[PDB]
């Protein structure tokens, strides 16, 4: 608001900004012997008493202007004070009205109060972290320097319009300032468009603006610098302030202050139910068959392909564990972003050189110079499809990562920096699982999501040893106990059905593994609102080794590659009956009536020997969600 | 911030 | 929940914890040729199908136990599978039920889900930061070490009861564990009461518990270590986990996990409308009259008194700027806490030696070895009484601190650590004001709160120069312009009314000061839901000096000491008419009809010369709010 | 935490 009191001794000059209610205090300087007052104003202004009225402090007077001023002091308001003694006293007030409007994409539409509220009925604009490189001759993220090097970069910013409508000689006695609070001055940068030079950044908290009189519009471009984290909730305030500088001896006086609130776009992942767009892989040695199978699967699925040759590969074939692809979106642009794990094996150059580029951001967190564990591999990093739990909706899913049940002396955990970053990204509130028992410790080794036409749309697949044991019991009691597992593989010993069925240590180990799987299944059923109809069991066998950790007895068939309605499942080399393996037949009969095609790829000698599967060695980029994140209420 | 993470990774 | 599937091949032993729903999966191991099933159970258990029923996966079976088990495997449930071929197949399940209950003061009552929700209908217990020293022979905050040195310290903790009801031989094949997440293990400590030894702390993430069979109860005492901050929201989780250790070769398996959530009590201030309990002051030199006036005011107000002698004073008399007293409360105990400013003038020993003691906590934030500004003095630290703004209630008021209008090169600000701490204390969301223009820069120099019988209960008092100018205009035009200001003071020059009224530079400076005061008044009116009837103007005059900063022309009468219904107001030494000063008469006639008594104390030669007033040199302790903070929803 | 603040102040 604006409070201007009138004094009969001398006339008063004041500025009334259009869009702001201005109340007149009419008792501060009122004549002592006075009893009543009257108001007469010019037609250009509207006066509301909320003929003669008493001067009691309760009553109030509001003034509203309709059009911008063409000249200084072009409206006049007169107040006649009526007293029982002496003639009435006249007080004068001169009004000049300006129009100062700082506007952004507050409606989240794409065209250009003062608070950011989630939900479809909310208001507040969105920034995008300029984490890409639109310059083809640069070797730095374009938000590191203080210049705009190419007009295409302008598309990754946010627009802000300053509309000014003032008289011609207005700004000879007034000044405009743009600023951001000192705690956020190091997480934002603002350029002025005329081609563009910096205005606000990590070294200039505030800048004075040069604006001419009359009508004018100014264009500002805003770019964020840091993703939201524990120390930075994500709200950035930009403030426009009008200062009076009439007298040179005196300092400036603030007379009007408007502001806008921006939210930094969070990092949003993509689950397995989204259509693919691009597939990454690796080539190291004896990989012609594996790469050929991946290529034909990609061709069938109608997507791209990117392959790293061995020169830059450095004998590292686990693309999944190093990088994870998500997206960041805003009403005017949606661009993917690669997340680089603190793990720095031979593939530390691929995500930093061959991935990030034009319209491909890059962000990473944690300590890079060692001090991590296997749980930091992106194996413990999955997302469930949109879910509804006990009346609360998550249209963007929930992050799932695994760690130890309780802290101890030999327990491991995901790095705290990564955990806090994921938690700070609210839109997918993370959920913890118990996956420390695995030797590598990857939640990708026991859970998987598949798109389904019916019911909720998805179907979680979990590894369960009982399923394999019942299949083997059937194979034995129909009389084919002579079947040899690992027949196709020559180097590894073939095992007959009776021996594996009568083994006792293996049964005990699989009972322990089943108990862990049951606990995780109950956790997922509680946290994702699942019934028993949305969970499918795929047979598998686990065996314990040094320090009692579980490893896949035969290739893990839960860690499969899903591309729309096509599946690349690791070949188990299970026992064959009537010229078809029982494991493959069972899994095909379990997944096909859902509307899928199953293709088994062999990676025993190239991946399984080094404790890996297909999905652990390939990565997929997926189309961003159609649902706008800002429309969800956390 | 995130730029500094970029430079540190590229150095390694 | 608990999922136990039955297999007809062999009987199954399982543990069903009382208070947990247990569902039976009856299709995982069901006979292939089977078509129907029946259930018969012992009377001790209750079975619900949610006679013969189909074995379709949709149907489910729930099991509920009523009483704790006296012996292992004392309940039996039998399932008869009926098939068109072969005789029916019988499956068995043996049940032993235990009772494990970890309980705290979740109802916020004082007597001894799994989430902390604010509001009167919420649930969740409260910890207290053990920031006092109950040991009279110790020189450390009692939460620094890892021992309990006196039974009285036990009163500053939180109780937790572990109730166990199991068979006699139960714990020969099971184990109990207590733990806290690794990110909160360094902000909590838990002792076991038998006298008490540590169980959980910043060096033991988890501890195994030794419990006997039968009935038993265990007492745990919990104490927090850190106040809530930006890096620590305030939620602490303590988890009890039951592990199965039947087989020695295999590792432990988690089978049940309960938890409790605690909130660390925030630091809550006290406004000026609360009754006083204790008054602090100082004595340096020529202070007999000032101290005597403070003593008689305290005696009239029925409170205590604490005085610092000059040996420990080190020629520092501004107690207000160094320390601020608030309280922290929990359903079982409410204790005050002193907040020490980063300012380290001669009074750095009083809050650390003569204040903190038995039932008096101490907490401080910021950099101590320099790097602060005058705005860090507790002058910019006030609280408004309970307020209702636009339908939202604040029964504990709002923090008010001042800083610059916009960031610049010569602007100052409160330290970011203090600002983030105050923001992290949610219960009083802070409000910023424009008080950089003052030479010292203290919001205590222009605003003040007074208790009022009527209306909202309070009345904000603001410094306004116009009031003084209208009083002087009246004094001149009634013919007493000969009155001399500063008559009582001999060293300072006396000023006549005509000269001060006709001064032009002073009028310009006071116009600037009035503009700043008007902006702050509008800010407060917007942020505290005030009308024009809740704000009282007390006359004052400001003058500008080096770098154009405002100083009080005559003693500041807004910075007064309020003790219930008694007032110590600095004596302005204003011009006198008919043997009474006009300023004192006006202020007395303005404050008395509210129901107060006004006493003027003289501190011109001892405080005003060093730019201070009474309230800036004394501190008051006040009774905590009757309204429970946890009852407010932020 | 707050204990460390206590020790640092007492030292000064
Ligand atoms: Ca740039
Ligand atoms: Ca860009
Ligand atoms: Ca890396
Ligand atoms: Ca771009
Ligand atoms: Ca992944
Ligand atoms: Ca202790
Ligand atoms: Ca204590
Ligand atoms: Ca101190
Ligand atoms: Ca105590
Ligand atoms: Ca204070």
Numbering used by the authors:
A (entry chain A), C (entry chain B): 4 to 53, 66 to 127, 136 to 217, 224 to 663
B (entry chain C), D (entry chain D): 1 to 12
Sentences reproduced from the published study:
The peptidylarginine deiminase enzymes (PADIs, or PADs, herein referred to as PADIs) catalyse the post-translational conversion of protein arginine residues to non-coded citrulline, in a process termed citrullination or peptidylarginine deimination. PADI4 possesses a nuclear localisation sequence and targets a variety of nuclear substrates, including core and linker histones, through which it modulates gene expression and chromatin compaction. PADIs require calcium for catalysis, and the sequential binding of calcium ions results in a large structural rearrangement that forms the active site cleft. We report PADI4_3, a cell-active inhibitor specific for the active conformation of PADI4; PADI4_7, an inert binder, which we functionalise for the isolation and study of cellular PADI4; and PADI4_11, a cell-active PADI4 activator.
The lead-activating peptide, PADI4_11, lowers the calcium requirement for activation in vitro and induces activation within cells in the absence of any additional stimuli. We then used cryoEM to elucidate the mode of binding of PADI4_11 to PADI4 and were able to obtain a structure with an overall resolution of 3.6 Å. As for the structure with the inhibitor PADI4_3 described above, PADI4 adopts a homodimeric structure. PADI4_11 adopts an alpha-helical structure with the internal cyclisation bridge between C4 and the N-terminus of the peptide acting like a peptide staple. The structure revealed that PADI4_11 binds to a surface of PADI4 distal to the active site, but close to the five calcium ion binding sites. The peptide binds in a cleft formed between two loops in PADI4 (D155-V171 and P371–387). PADI4_11 binding in this region thus fits well with our observations that PADI4_11 activates PADI4 by reducing its calcium dependency, since peptide binding likely alters the dynamics of this region and may, therefore, directly increase calcium binding affinities. By contrast, substitution of E2 by alanine, aspartic acid or glutamine all resulted in loss of activity, suggesting the importance of the appropriate side chain length, as well as negative charge in position 2 of PADI4_11, in allowing it to form a salt bridge with R394 in PADI4. The structural and mutagenesis analyses presented here reveal that PADI4_11 binds at an allosteric site on PADI4, in a region of the protein that is disordered in calcium-free crystal structures but becomes structured upon calcium binding.
